[model samples]
Target: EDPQLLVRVRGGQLRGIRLKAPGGPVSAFLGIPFAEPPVGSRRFMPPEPKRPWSGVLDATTFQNVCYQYVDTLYPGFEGTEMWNPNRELSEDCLYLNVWTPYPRPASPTPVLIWIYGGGFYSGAASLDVYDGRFLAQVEGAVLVSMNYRVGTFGFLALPGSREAPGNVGLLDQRLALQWVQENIAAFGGDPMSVTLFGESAGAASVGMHILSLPSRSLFHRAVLQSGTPNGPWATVSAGEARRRATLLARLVGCPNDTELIACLRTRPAQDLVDHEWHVLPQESIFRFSFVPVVDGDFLSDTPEALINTGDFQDLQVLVGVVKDEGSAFLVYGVPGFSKDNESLISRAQFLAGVRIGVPQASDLAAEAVVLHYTDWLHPEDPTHLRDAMSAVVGDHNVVCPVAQLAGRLAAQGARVYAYIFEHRASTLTWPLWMGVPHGYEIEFIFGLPLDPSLNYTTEERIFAQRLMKYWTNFARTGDPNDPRDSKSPQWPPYTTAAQQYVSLNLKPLEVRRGLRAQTCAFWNRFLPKLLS
Candidate 1:
């Protein structure tokens, strides 16, 4: 190892690794702790800053991801296996990974930081696609990823105890940003130009940071991909986090609500996570059990309610979604539905899938949902039934919520650039009909094609290059096009009046407006009226 790979930060001197990537040479600093391990009595409490250490810290290896059970659903399928955490799970997992452009930029460059997403339950920086090497080398930006606790370990709220506050998972993310503010300059990162970005639950966290007053200044911009702060499953309903905390404690023999927090601290971390969904299996897909709560502090109110106050209007935000987000969700959300042989669906199955997605709505409301989404033109075709199911699932879960969030933020005069990712990567083994599903954009945005072993076609490599530029350009200047390649297709800012957004496809993505306007209108406009 070259001794020059060592960089000094606030905590101590650290050692990283140098790598040869397609974009050129890059230095990667992995597994640097930002906060003290939240273990023992500190298990569920908000993170405390890490104390400075002696000598040079070894940051050459990726550390453990937070402890949690990972269910890939499809054993060897690319559709799900792409997200499998490639590291051991441990309770002491507050580590950060930084990739800096080698021959360090004389001037500090913007930082593109990532938060992994698995519905807030399971995710880690160790995912292969999340590798920051090429991103830093190609974009000339410091790329950072951090490990935050997930599931019961990260989110057990305690109205029951002063020691165990809620949304510590979010606090973990915030503390890492605070770490960036204090130390990234040493690695040639521009602290003032950090773009906080994530997908799914990670995107939800990014949105929360935008709404979060205390942590808002930690990053200068945000990218919300395939998620929104107000998504139905983004955060638990009021008091729901507490209820799950109570349930988790009882499952692990901490019967008394008063003694629960302390006892859980002593219990094996795995035991707490094992029982997270066993007690409420139905809450799996549609409503996650252990998620963020509006804990008066980190999260003050609902995302929409907070945005309604117009306090975070000036933040530059880029929010987008994959075209068929729901296609990836059908098998998981609908009971008795699986990928074994879902070639063709029935109208009955389509309606059942819709009902499961939003069981809270009355039959009549669900009926209207069925009436609007069912393609009567092809009611007789079973294949169209599959399309209908995916359409309803994608629209309900991702598309509408993202559009609504963008509209709400744009309504407040914020600079919001929204997008719809329609280009489907060839790596996915999902049926062609699945189109571009949720999280399908990960490889493209991460420049996975740049690695020749992945065997992406020449066209894909070119597309990935454009996508990376678009994302990093936004990170560099907050405008996806300026200060970068002006020749890349125009990405107009999203405004309430025009609702303009780029339709990201194989070509120079065309700028469009009102993503899924009629379907989104049904969800955001009409349904709420009917519910009232």
Candidate 2:
């Protein structure tokens, strides 16, 4: 039998479907179109709102993921498991999937908008890890995961692009939020109580939204996992983008062709994939060339700079990086790992850079990096060296930034919380490794164990339940401090006095000064100038 469903919303009628929950009845509406399809003429332009529909649209299955390279995160991606199963990639993609625990006449649930991460080049909401059914059933909050443009389609800011240039990807996210604000009530959600959450690139994107002018009043609180606002390599500028695009065009074999821009955009998707064209340069201080840019409009200033100066002073924030946030990228042991050491120290001799000290202090820095981030060296290998490397890079890139941001937020009198995921998984290796790695915390957050092989123990399940509770509480109340007085710790608000951070581990709880201050300070002053 078809699940019992609702037929109307406030302005427009919504078709709600029934679910398997104990609360008399449960309803969900999935794959709703939030914006006009960003295909053909709409490509590279600000998102357009979806025209009002005539009838109740079926909301059971998910929409196609945004246009992405054939081989993104999924291995053997061209196989029948993904694209051919009617979830094909395409430019006509700006759609969202939602799940609600209840769709009663007068129900109000906090909304959780999820932003997927793929290095600003890959990722979508349709990934199996983001199933919102568990979140809706367990947390009882409306979970909305939407697809934003990725790769060249999203961040491509070439000449003659529209006013909202480089941030079309971010615009996609904003449009989704706006859609929720206008229509989420139909699915039993409190649009005013929306919380934005993401990991890695998604987290970074949230940070950008926290500072963006268009995103104000869109979300009340934010959760940043494994990424933070205080990274030198996190953002870019237009001039730099143009230069990078020129090089990219050259590598893609359209060096002098004036129509190279349109040609590549119109060319077959798979043909554009090339080692030199897409693989980020090792020496790049800003990691990916295709990243969020400071276009002086949507993004007024650098997020780190703005946040440091008390810009997001009133926003409730829960931000932290994993214990091994750097392990994912560090495993390659690629070239230019020592750029800041040689260029900023010996070559430039400019001590004003973000991470101070260089050639002379290079040995100590190297040792610290090796000691703390060894896990990133050989992520697939279960060796102690790789583990240590992961920790080091985690501390430098993820942990340190999180601590710094938390401290600053506390100083600004903003409500803030922090966490560190120490769960280690042996199967997480390219071929094998385990527990929580870079993105392993997503399932725990949603309380969905997608990987049966990587199933959680009873204690892990308890932790996951507690986390979902904490997240929903934060979304509902703007503070993670628990009200029901359950098993949650007395999560103290972050302040300079306590410098506390919640540790999300097998034994999940809180810890004071969860990171090193002296080392972060050392990095802050120890490197030479690269660029603003």
Candidate 3:
């Protein structure tokens, strides 16, 4: 381990030294604080600036997670018995960890700030998947991840909560970015060259921050993995958020009065988590659906809307989705529905308020999906229904929106890149049910080999390494076209002429052109006129 050193900031001292690098004398630091903890009166408020400290504070160990019940949500979360590096929780959880390739006086390295996703209900910045050791050491960039309030604690919209409503997670992200801008130079990171990236809910957050007033000039580049800037999945209206909050209160046995909101604020974290855990997979509007809403203040508008209308000036973006992003949702019981699937369609319509005709709403929807997708499945294929549902749900919830958002970005002439992950390890039921499903690409992007149990062959391993390189390279440069690595196609900037996107799979990576136009064309005619 590299010897410790103290860093002096506005309010306090952070003792962040380093760990010895693998190859040479280079070193890196792990956990560091960026803001004062958002506890007590600050619980539901925007992050406050850190107050200065006189002496060094130990930053050698990671901090506790914000109030969360991740075990209920993901089943595999590590508890105290797990010996995980970050398995604890507390109200005081506004901490961030950084990995830098040894600060140098000249030529600061690019910074990559990561935001983890859990539908705004779960997830911490300290997840092992987001560990920056490899990205910083191998890619020669600085990586940072921070914790933010989640669930009702971060987004509930009560009377007093109205002041800091709907986007506390996004505000936390902005605070982290601001901290990076002020302190990254000391950690060998070029603040001006910072890029924000995330997956699913995290990707949605990056999109939100890209359109936020407080974050307008914070980051120069962004990477939205399996998420997009616009569409129904990204931004929510303030009224809608308030309605959801009210519903959440009702579920937790809190009355719909002024005291109701305060009751939740003081309730035990475990009770809250337990009360709401089962509702995530249900078709209730209030069940675990806490996304960023259009608050007219912090998050003024949707990123797609802003970018399409030329609101963002001279920005760069990289947007992508797994070949199958809906797999996890389905396995977790949040599957998609089409018109042909009457039961599924009815459930979805009931949840989302999408109205069809008087008699055959599900049939109408199913017909429209078939007309839009044009993909055929063998009638006897055992997994046909699952595959079709995955495509429909994946497109509506992930792919289609991402494509439209990318097209909107291109229309504005902002430098952009896109990708689709197609590699699948056979060991898991997911590859068969939802190919390259959801966050499965994270393992590959982090340079982990596909499981042999999943039947991943030697060729797949080669593909995974290169795919990780492409992502890490983009984190370093706004462009994913790595001049050093020639095995993959030169990812062309997304433009009207070609609209090229890179595809990552078991075989040689391929460049897909005209995807934006094709996908947009497919969705334009597919969107239902039915009001939701």
Pick the TM-score winner.
Answer: 1
| Tens-digit lDDT track of model 1 for 303-346 | 76886776555688999999888777777756545666665866
- The candidate scoring highest on lDDT is 1
CA lDDT of every candidate: 0.83, 0.65, 0.64
lDDT of 3 by residue, 1-532 (tens): 2333455555556666555444332344445666678775565677777777667677766778877755443345332112122557777778888776654324778888888876677777666566666566556777888887777667655433544465776777788888888988876678878888888878878887777667868888888988765765555566767766676677877773446656666666677666655433334221246666676677556555575676443778888888777545543433343212332332333223322111123555655554444334453333454455556566666887787777777776678888887767543432344457677776567544533443456776566567657766776776776766665546777775677887877756578776536545655444445322
TM-score between candidate 1 and the true structure: 0.96
Off-target runs (Cα >4 Å) in candidate 1 are 1-3, 279-284, 333-336, 482-488
Steric collisions counted per model:
1, 36, 12
What are the per-residue Cα lDDT tens digits for candidate 2 across 270-389?
454343245454332225547777677767766667777855567798887655565455422323222122211211111112122112235445444333333454433434533343
Model 2 TM:
0.82
- Give per-residue lDDT, candidate 3, residue 119: 68
TM-score of each: 0.96, 0.82, 0.83
* Model 1 / residue 264 / CA error / Å: 2.1
**Span of 10 residues, lowest total lDDT, candidate 1:** 278-287
Looking at model 1, residue 191 earns an lDDT score of: 94
Candidate 3 regions exceeding 4 Å error are 1-5, 20-28, 72-86, 102-106, 159-164, 256-258, 277-288, 334-363, 370-381, 425-431, 448-465, 484-488, 516-522, 530-532
